[PDB]
Design a protein around this ligand. Structure first.
Ligand code: PEB
Ligand code: PEB
Ligand code: PEB
Ligand code: PEB
Ligand code: PEB
Ligand code: PEB
Ligand code: PEB
Ligand code: PEB
Ligand code: PEB
Ligand code: PEB
Ligand code: PEB
Ligand code: PEB
Ligand code: PUB
Ligand code: PUB
Lengths: 40, 164, 177, 275, 177, 164, 164, 177
């Protein structure tokens, strides 16, 4: 084993709850790491 | 401590809810498990003064270089540390068989373990060379019951994945 | 998520109907294997420190462009990454076999990693190749057909349910790229 | 204590009283089943058919030639063009449509056999087909050990056109029929092995065919002693032609029991058809 | 059914060949080892009631999962039916070791032998373990390397017959796996 | 097939029984007279083109009626097939000197011979008498050994016996 | 009965068939080793009172529990019948050296032995082990010829095999 | 396209191997149930008029908002194109069944179809209600469970390929959401 555990690193897509939130932090909370995942 | 009861109410404290009907068939899951669970625990206590020797000499029947000068098992007061430290690993197994989780392992014996074995020059796989001899020594109707042997060997799978 | 019991809810919710006498031969079918379904979920998490160590080493010893100088596993940072980066996929199917459905396998990891491995460098040749070495070894443990360690179990057939562990990778296979 | 570069691997020491230390070792413990690999559109798990499972094409082949084996053997019964009197399948009153429902129950109850008796009857009929043919071939058993209905329609078909069956060879005295009766009791004991009565001597479903099965045999019991004087004389020589050669080999006592009592050795029915 | 005096002819009938003295030296070696094969096969059937009892005790020694209730092989009719099937394969390989040819092995049991067992629910990993014990004691009896039991022979090499029995139980073992 | 292997390993299977010493005894008689049996095999392998031609028109001397149209020997195309027919009998009798019994004869060239020949209007009386020409055609201390002709000659009059 | 005569003249009748040369071959192996088989018969005819007494209390050394009342050996009247019982086994094995196979064993003294003994509370474990005492009790170049013990010793471990 | 002979052959390129005796029996496990499959192909193609037209007629009286103004079954520009967008999925699953593989089926009509259906204003939950009815008539030809119009076939169960036509029906159910 690598460390004590193997948990999900927070630099993945869909790393949030995103349920009844504001408009400015829905599409910031959804589409977390699309800055290079589509642009390439 | 990680057990079968600590998952139920720390989720329900995070839920802000009562213990529902969903939360209690881990407890029906407990008592169907806990009948043939604890037969394994007291059976270990009727043998363990030989068992930490008979699995403890096997790592010296595997790695004879520990008795060399400059090494960890170089003299007799350091070899009785090696039977101190292997009896305390198998004292946490029967604690882990009572609570039905893994919490006594993951606080007193696994948490902070591999940072001190490096600094004190102890081999991280000679420990799992020892309790591997605990794993093949089972013949399942004789030492254990027919189901209780697998639930005892499943905690031997946890600790060799903790050091390796 | 959805387990194997919550699969038959939502499509029978989609038919606006009740859980009738049609699916009683499926919700008695998962009741029967739950001795050996729980016996099979133990068989992967027991050996998983040896399993992901064998999965990287078999990938590296036949494809030495991962130990290219300046490559994807050249540094000690990039070698300790891939020991974790292919182990979480082994961890996520260990929940998906226990649920009896791979509904957790899409909305937790397969939503994204096809366009995320190329987004920081990790190519398409060996990440597909890292799954198949775990795939023919996951079928060996649940059938007790390994070469070096024979697990002491009861007698019975395992082509039906060991299957589920392969299945949970379709997910990590296609859309690992 | 201190090593050297010398080569003494060889050598021993002799002071091996060595009964004082005993040692062992292990390794093993690893079965393997061939599993399918490359993945989508597929995943296969082993299933119980409890049958022959040697092909769908082989299964529909298997009932056609054994129908032709039975129609071969219906054409030795009717070699000369007679529906000969040993075959009876009814009563006085017509009731062979009622004995259709007896035989289609036997077509159904042998189909709803459980997995032990479906599989036991596959292998005992294979060695009995070796017993059924006299000669040893490259052909005949090379149908009769892959295919089992062909083996089953040979141990029924060839044996019914000799006269070593039940209820066809007539005993002479009270002494022959009594040990004829007693060897039938162990054939009850074979098909009724314990306190449960089997599903396979059920010989009926409705109230009409309950007593039709009793009066069917009593007309056929009469048609043993009715039909001839030489074919029933050929029966008592034929009764040793199934028992001496492939049922009681090695036992002289059970060999002269046939040659002293052929009609008692004719309902011994060791073809274990659970009847 | 077929033997080594008939295996040599059956290929020659596919080419309609007269048999000559170009292949009879294989059979002259076979008729050389007439008593040598006969001094092998008497030692098999000398102690083969002990061989059945040694095998399915040692197969239970490695695995107590059968004797557990709910198992495949645990009760008294079941063990008598286990001791039935444990003998019948040892009965058959002695015929082929008498024949010098395993044609009689194939047609009489191995046609569909493998998955009548899973038509009965019989574990096939336990079958190959038990006949491996029956492999291992059989070569010790056609040699003189038993524990206590040293039969009377005349000395000489018998490893050609020991390779012939080595080609026999695995042909069963591949036909049950 | 048909040999002593087809007797005793099949009867022990027909009894469901071990290869006991009744079965181990029966093959010893192969060993002491295979040398008696297998210098006869290379005689008719050495004469596999010599005595096929001398048996055909010895048969066609005493069966000279065949050459008319509408019969079994109406052209040389029949006679080109006819030396094939005696040689195909002659192949199998050579093989029965090797397997011991009449193994290749009965399952290949004997059974159902009485369903073929006069249906194809081939005379069976010429078939046994071509063979009965070769049955007495031997000389036991001169052609082969004296221990070789009694396996040969007992198979040839068997060919008339098996057509009976 | 059980011999090679019980194989081949019965199988030719079971085929409805002549005594062909498969049947004539099988008895030749009697002739070349009847001299091997029949100096073993007068050994246990010469020792028909010698080795019955040496096998009884060799069995009763390792089965010495019988002498209590309520068991199989409660008085000398049982032991007077017990030397009759081993000799009646010993009569038949002498006869199987004459007929070739195990002819007088199976139809007289073997079949249904497992319906008699513990029903009469006679231990079957002492019956095979009295015979297994005499099974290894041989010396092949010293007591008999070397061609005589391999028929003798193969029948005695058969007696343990036939009770299995 | 890699069809259903060739999906395992590309992994031997990845594992640096041949085709050997390993999948030699598993490649013709595809074969003997194949004219069982080829009988189960043509009757779906024989009724290609209904299984596009019923899958919108089961979405008119089950969604009254679609023929309503605003819904996507309103205009006869759309109503003609409701079956022009519907006859694609009917012919490509017969392409899927005769090829056996699905590798070409998730890029020729699934790579792209989600990001245009967010631009045409599609209720995608109603579009999977528009294919669930299409899933339930394909069983009525390959298992002959048709209570309205039967077709004559050979009596033998073809249940191994029952939901393998339906195993691609739920891949587009995830590829549209
Ligand atoms: C397997 C069958 C088989 C055969 C029968 C022969 C066929 C055959 N036999 C003889 C050999 C012969 N040798 C003799 C001499 C004999 N002296 C005596 O004291 C006896 C009366 C008589 C034994 C038959 C006679 C009469 C013939 C046949 C006539 C002839 O010479 O052609 C010859 C002439 C050449 C030779 O001598 O070898 C031929 C072609 N070959 C075969 O392969
Ligand atoms: C049919 C069965 C049958 C028997 C077994 C004997 C039984 C028997 N065997 C021996 C003969 C014996 N001869 C030996 C000598 C031997 N020298 C060696 O190199 C070998 C190791 C060993 C062969 C066993 C031994 C150990 C005994 C048994 C002990 C004894 O002398 O009583 C004796 C003593 C008298 C004698 O020497 O003949 C007796 C009564 N008689 C029988 O009728
Ligand atoms: C609460 C639970 C608990 C444990 C799990 C152990 C763990 C443990 N072991 C050691 C300490 C040690 N452990 C060993 C043991 C070994 N070296 C070898 O050659 C073998 C591989 C192995 C025995 C088989 C030795 C030799 C030391 C002494 C270290 C030293 O000499 O500096 C120490 C340091 C303190 C000490 O010296 O005792 C600790 C904390 N102790 C605990 O209290
Ligand atoms: C609490 C758990 C527990 C165990 C795991 C065993 C472990 C164990 N085994 C033995 C002693 C033994 N243990 C076994 C058992 C086995 N040897 C094998 O080869 C098989 C794997 C297995 C079942 C057949 C045997 C055969 C011995 C005798 C000597 C030996 O081989 O170790 C002893 C010495 C005292 C005794 O016999 O009890 C101990 C402590 N006993 C226990 O009390
Ligand atoms: C939810 C599930 C989940 C995942 C899948 C991962 C996804 C993931 N992978 C990497 C990152 C990586 N993953 C690899 C992995 C590999 N390179 C190879 O040649 C092999 C094919 C393979 C290992 C088997 C490498 C080399 C990196 C980059 C490390 C670096 O940038 O130095 C990172 C960047 C953060 C980091 O490196 O720690 C993330 C978020 N994390 C998650 O939380
Ligand atoms: C429709 C399926 C069908 C079969 C599987 C075979 C099997 C078969 N063979 C025979 C009939 C026979 N079978 C043999 C047997 C043999 N002859 C030899 O020389 C060999 C040693 C041995 C195996 C080939 C003989 C000699 C006969 C004729 C005499 C008899 O009926 O026994 C019969 C009895 C009726 C008949 O004559 O046809 C049957 C069912 N025949 C069939 O019609
Ligand atoms: C009156 C007609 C009559 C026969 C034709 C025979 C045939 C025969 N034997 C057995 C039953 C038996 N038959 C034998 C006989 C033998 N086992 C051997 O090892 C020897 C070779 C052989 C003759 C001694 C034995 C030992 C049993 C009991 C075990 C069994 O069920 O097979 C049965 C089943 C029930 C029964 O005992 O009757 C039958 C029909 N017995 C008969 O009663
Ligand atoms: C814990 C359970 C247990 C047992 C019940 C025994 C049973 C047993 N025996 C052997 C192995 C063997 N067993 C025999 C059998 C015998 N030897 C004799 O002298 C007798 C005639 C006969 C006993 C009835 C022989 C000849 C071998 C080969 C090695 C040897 O000589 O021991 C093997 C290993 C097979 C192999 O090599 O793969 C096993 C498991 N051993 C065990 O560990
Ligand atoms: C009916 C019963 C019956 C028998 C048991 C045999 C008996 C037998 N075995 C051998 C003779 C032999 N048998 C063997 C075989 C073996 N010896 C060993 O030490 C090994 C354990 C075993 C190997 C498998 C050997 C090596 C010889 C010696 C061959 C010789 O001396 O030429 C001989 C001497 C003839 C010879 O082969 O040269 C005889 C008659 N024949 C029979 O008719
Ligand atoms: C391998 C086994 C085998 C045999 C035992 C023989 C037997 C045999 N001969 C013929 C067939 C024949 N056999 C003969 C031979 C003869 N006709 C006579 O009247 C003469 C006595 C004799 C020539 C010396 C002829 C002439 C034919 C052809 C008949 C025809 O086609 O009309 C056939 C029909 C098929 C065929 O043409 O081969 C068979 C089975 N042939 C074999 O293949
Ligand atoms: C011809 C075939 C033939 C045999 C194979 C034997 C077998 C045999 N023994 C006994 C009967 C007996 N057999 C024994 C013998 C013994 N009991 C033991 O536990 C010792 C091991 C052993 C003495 C050494 C005794 C003591 C009896 C009498 C039992 C009694 O009457 O209670 C019986 C019952 C009828 C009788 O009394 O004879 C039979 C069939 N006897 C035979 O007639
Ligand atoms: C050109 C077009 C073309 C086809 C249509 C198929 C036609 C076809 N179908 C089958 C044959 C078959 N087909 C089926 C299939 C079924 N039976 C049912 O009732 C279900 C509807 C369905 C799926 C379970 C079965 C069960 C068989 C018999 C299996 C066998 O042949 O052994 C066969 C082989 C034997 C036979 O004729 O029966 C053929 C040629 N092949 C072609 O080349
Ligand atoms: C498969 C279950 C089954 C049946 C059987 C029939 C039952 C049946 N058997 C018949 C009649 C019947 N039963 C036999 C006896 C026997 N069978 C033979 O084919 C030969 C050659 C035999 C002699 C041993 C014969 C010969 C006949 C006469 C007609 C015939 O089958 O050719 C008749 C009609 C004769 C009449 O009108 O009275 C019927 C309805 N139906 C079924 O459902
Ligand atoms: C001689 C031609 C003949 C028959 C066969 C039977 C057919 C038959 N069996 C009956 C009744 C019957 N039938 C069987 C089946 C069969 N019979 C057995 O004795 C055993 C052990 C069997 C399976 C192998 C059993 C077991 C019974 C129950 C007997 C009882 O309990 O009285 C009844 C009674 C129905 C009633 O009136 O209540 C009849 C008519 N009768 C006959 O006249």
């Amino acid at each position: 084993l690598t460390g004590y555990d193997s948990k999900s690193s927070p630099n993945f897509p869909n790393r949030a709850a995103t349920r009844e939130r504001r408009t400015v932090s829905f599409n910031a909370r959804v589409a977390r790491n699309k800055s290079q995942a589509k642009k390439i | 401590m990680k057990s079968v009861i600590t998952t139920v109410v720390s989720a329900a404290d995070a839920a802000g809810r009562f213990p529902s009907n969903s939360d209690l068939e881990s407890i029906q899951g407990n008592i169907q498990r806990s009948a043939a669970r604890l037969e394994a625990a007291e059976k270990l206590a009727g043998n363990h003064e030989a068992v930490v020797k008979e699995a403890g000499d096997a790592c010296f029947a595997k790695y004879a270089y520990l008795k060399n000068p400059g090494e960890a098992g170089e003299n007799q007061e350091k070899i009785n540390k090696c039977y101190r430290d292997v009896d305390h690993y198998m004292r946490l197994v029967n604690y882990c068989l009572v609570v039905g989780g893994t919490g006594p392992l993951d606080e007193w014996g696994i948490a902070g373990a591999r940072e001190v074995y490096r600094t004190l020059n102890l081999p991280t796989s000679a420990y799992v060379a020892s309790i591997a001899y605990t794993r093949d020594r089972l013949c399942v109707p004789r030492d254990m019951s027919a189901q209780a042997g697998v639930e005892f060997s499943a905690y031997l799978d946890y600790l060799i994945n903790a050091l390796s | 998520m959805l387990d194997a019991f919550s699969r038959v809810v939502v499509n029978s919710d989609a038919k606006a109907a009740y859980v009738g006498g049609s699916d009683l031969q499926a919700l008695k079918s998962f009741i029967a294997d739950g001795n050996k379904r729980l016996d099979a979920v133990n068989s992967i998490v027991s050996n998983a420190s040896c399993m992901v160590s064998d999965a990287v080493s078999g990938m590296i010893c036949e494809n030495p462009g991962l130990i290219s100088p300046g490559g994807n596993c050249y540094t000690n940072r990039r070698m300790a990454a891939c020991l974790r980066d292919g182990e979480i996929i082994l961890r996520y199917v260990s929940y998906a076999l226990l649920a009896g459905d791979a509904s957790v396998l899409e909305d937790r990891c397969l939503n994204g990693l096809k366009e995320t491995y190329i987004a920081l460098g990790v190519p398409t040749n060996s990440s597909i190749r890292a799954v198949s070495i775990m795939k023919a070894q996951a079928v060996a443990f649940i059938t007790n057909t390994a070469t070096e360690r024979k697990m002491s179990f009861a007698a019975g057939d395992c082509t039906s349910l060991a299957s589920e562990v392969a299945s949970y990778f379709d997910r990590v296979g296609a859309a690992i790229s | 204590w201190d090593k050297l570069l010398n080569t003494k691997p060889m050598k021993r020491q002799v002071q091996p009283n060595p009964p004082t230390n005993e040692t062992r070792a292990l390794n093993l413990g690893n079965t393997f089943r061939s599993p399918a690999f490359k993945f989508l559109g597929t995943l296969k798990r082993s299933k119980d058919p409890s049958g022959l499972r040697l092909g769908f094409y082989g299964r529909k082949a298997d009932d056609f030639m054994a129908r032709s084996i039975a129609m071969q053997a219906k054409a030795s019964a009717a070699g000369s063009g007679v529906y000969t009197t040993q075959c009876s399948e009814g009563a006085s009153k017509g009731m062979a449509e009622n004995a259709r429902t007896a035989s289609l129950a036997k077509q159904f109850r042998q189909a709803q056999r459980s997995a032990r008796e479906m599989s036991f009857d596959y292998y005992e009929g294979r060695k009995y087909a070796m017993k059924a043919v006299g000669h040893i071939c490259n052909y005949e058993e090379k149908i009769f050990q892959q295919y089992n209905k062909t083996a089953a329609a040979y141990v029924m078909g060839k044996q019914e056109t000799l006269l070593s069956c039940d209820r066809y060879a007539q005993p002479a005295n009270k002494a022959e029929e009594y040990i004829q009766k007693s060897v039938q009791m162990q054939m009850k004991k074979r098909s009724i092995p314990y306190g449960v009565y089997t599903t396979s001597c059920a010989d009926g479903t409705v109230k009409g065919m309950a007593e039709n099965a009793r009066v069917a045999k009593e007309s056929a019991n009469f048609r043993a002693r009715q039909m001839s004087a030489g074919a029933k004389a050929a029966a008592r020589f034929n009764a040793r032609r199934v028992a001496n050669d492939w049922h009681n080999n090695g036992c002289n006592y059970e060999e002269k029991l046939t040659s002293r009592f052929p009609a008692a050795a004719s309902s011994v029915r060791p073809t274990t058809n659970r009847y």
